[PDB]
Amino acid sequence: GTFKDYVRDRADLNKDKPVIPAAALAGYTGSGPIQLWQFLLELLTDKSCQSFISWTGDGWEFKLSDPDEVARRWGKRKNKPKMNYEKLSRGLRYYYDKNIIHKTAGKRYVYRFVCDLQSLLGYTPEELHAMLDVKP
Amino acid sequence: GTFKDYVRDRADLNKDKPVIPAAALAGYTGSGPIQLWQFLLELLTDKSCQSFISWTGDGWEFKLSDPDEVARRWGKRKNKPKMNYEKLSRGLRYYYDKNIIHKTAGKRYVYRFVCDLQSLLGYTPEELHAMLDVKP
DNA sequence: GGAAGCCACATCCTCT
DNA sequence: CAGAGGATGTGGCTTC
DNA sequence: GGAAGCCACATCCTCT
DNA sequence: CAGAGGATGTGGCTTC
């Protein structure tokens, strides 16, 4: 397998094509280092990540079906191997007061984007959900 | 402008489409952090970067038409704002002994990939030069 | 998890 | 500077 | 370039 | 744990 085949094979697994690349987003917003909410928003728009993180179908609500995986990847993106959902959730918890992301009380591993995503990605959650083939 | 527009606009400038993405290459080779030679290989395959870095038309030979720009970007990709051609060249000098890249004596800012790129990107420099519309 | 190494540079400097 | 390399130091990663 | 700040987490801990 | 937050500490970046 050459580089060509390595890229080709990942494409056939629907990887490397998130609609909202974190890196790009950070660039657009001028946030500098990639931020958590941004990273999640990248995953949530990359069809290949739908197995461990996805939109519930209700507005900007999403679920961390596989916390441990979401955590690993965020841990990798920030170069922090000890990263787990137990510290990552702390990150998200900070957002509550900064009204960026809120916790949906009662549902394990479910939060919701509360800020104005439509203006940032020019898409109503209904459209986005259709583009990713969001089930519910 | 929204993130959507920001993405399509850069797309119309032929950006964000390098044939040999550094990040991917690093993954394929399992090198871990992106390496200099790999970065340069990304730029050289991204049609939008042809103004400050490009193949001379002779095999794997290339030129840093705009050293200062090349240096800035590499400085950005590694998070090292003080990054210049004066230091970056050092990095390249280190490949001379590791037969990965050599200096073409006589031409200011011109070096040549000496390792086996054909096997890594399954392309003869002739083909690659055609895909980028390399002039000389 | 965890400490100990290994490697690519990032930095600085000296010559020519 | 541009272009060789030696002397250092450290961060991100592989390795016990 | 350069020193001083700011901000987003990464880490740890305590309850319920 | 999962999930709220307080108390800390530091790296990447913005700001004088």
Author numbering:
A (entry chain D), B (entry chain A): 302 to 437
Task: Please share excerpts from the published article on this structure.
In the case of Ets1, autoinhibition is mediated by structural coupling of the regions flanking the DNA-binding domain.
To verify Ets1 dimer binding to two separate pieces of DNA we crystallized and solved the structure of the complex comprised of Ets1 dimer and two pieces of DNA [referred to as (Ets1)2•2DNA]. The DNA-binding areas of each Ets1 subunit are on the same side of the dimer and docked on two antiparallel pieces of dsDNA from TCRα promoter. Each Ets1 is bound to a separate piece of dsDNA resulting in formation of (Ets1)2•2DNA quaternary complex. However, within (Ets1)2•2DNA complex additional hydrogen bonds are observed between each Ets1 subunit and the neighboring DNA duplex. The potential hydrogen bonds involve the side chains of Asn380 and Lys383 from the loop H2H3 and DNA phosphate oxygen. Superimposition of Ets1 dimers with and without DNA shows that DNA binding introduces only minor local changes in Ets1 dimer structure with the root-mean-square deviations for the 271 matched α-carbon atoms at 0.86 Å. The only notable difference is the disorder of the seven N-terminal residues within (Ets1)2•2DNA complex.
